[PDB]
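Final report, results section. Input specification for complex C-07:
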Amino acid sequence: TNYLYVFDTTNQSIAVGSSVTFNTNGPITGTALSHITGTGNIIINTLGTYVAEFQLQASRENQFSLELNGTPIPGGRFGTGSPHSINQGTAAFTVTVVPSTLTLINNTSSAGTITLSNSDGGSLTNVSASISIFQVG
Amino acid sequence: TNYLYVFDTTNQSIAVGSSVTFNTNGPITGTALSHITGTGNIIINTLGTYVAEFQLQASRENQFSLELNGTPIPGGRFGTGSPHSINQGTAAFTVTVVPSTLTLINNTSSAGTITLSNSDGGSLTNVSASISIFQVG
Amino acid sequence: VGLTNYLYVFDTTNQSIAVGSSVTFNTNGPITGTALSHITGTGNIIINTLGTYVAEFQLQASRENQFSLELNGTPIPGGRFGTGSPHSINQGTAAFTVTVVPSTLTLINNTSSAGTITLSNSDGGSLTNVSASISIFQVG
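Structure output:
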């Protein structure tokens, strides 16, 4: 079955309207999902239903939405109201044209530009942002 | 494959013992799982094992459990100790009678009734609560 | 027809976790298939089928903390997660490939600055919460 994991380990900055980049690829199965390391783009090449999860650790309160083909997905936006705490969201979407593109967009954090942290809680390097996604139809 | 995504976008209030309602259906596939918009009832019509995940953003610390037919699911209860911080949990469970109902119940938050926040961290509307569930066996 | 491998384990205690130690889970949830096993009271998820697994963990501690998923004693790439807020969930979803069997998945205090971490089974409410948990399934 189709599965993809991507994550970032950097203190990248994301401005309103831009996407989270992922510098590393985890395990990828199947051929429906792909992703070029260093980009925020996740290419989807099979119609049907997908379930995506996102985690993002920033130094400020933030608001981020999953976006499909540049448009926010219904139920795809999550925010945190506490600094230095996780922003996490799981949501499903239907791909009706291929290739589609899934991104994670700074959908208007109040603070404006958001800077991620790969250092929270410990002295070792964290995943600062990640998406885990699989097809369910 | 049986999958369901429902989510809410409101600042609803939830009393101790009441369920979180979901105003919006995301993708649902299969015959096992369903939900009527506006309710907090996810109805499960096929026996087997299910993996449910919930997310909830509230204006203060809270405690919620997934319940099945009115009974807390073992491992279905999660709390957070920070206002405007996400209460997220993932729990698997077995359905031995059908149809059965899955709810997300205020159970039992210290502050009493819990009001959600659909506006944390940004200027657009967030998912204030949601469930992602699929059948594994 | 239904050979999905799936396991859910969770803990309901205020366990103390020294730097380098693993989160233990006192309770087994549903387990399907043959690949995955866990002896309660341990933090060891044993994996006896080669392939690719997705592991999600949740952890509720009284201080900010940094934990990593580890396989056979080595931190998994993309498996380390930290939060900067006390009494705030540490939540991470990562996927890894098991290249030898048996392999042991653990979740380890991979050096929170505060040192020994103590979980909370009581945040938010008057009932007992899941203070730590892992849900894992096989995708490849």
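Chain A touches chain C through 32 residues (CB under 8 Å). Residues 4 and 68 of chain A are 16 Å apart (CA to CA). This concludes the modelling results for the funded period.
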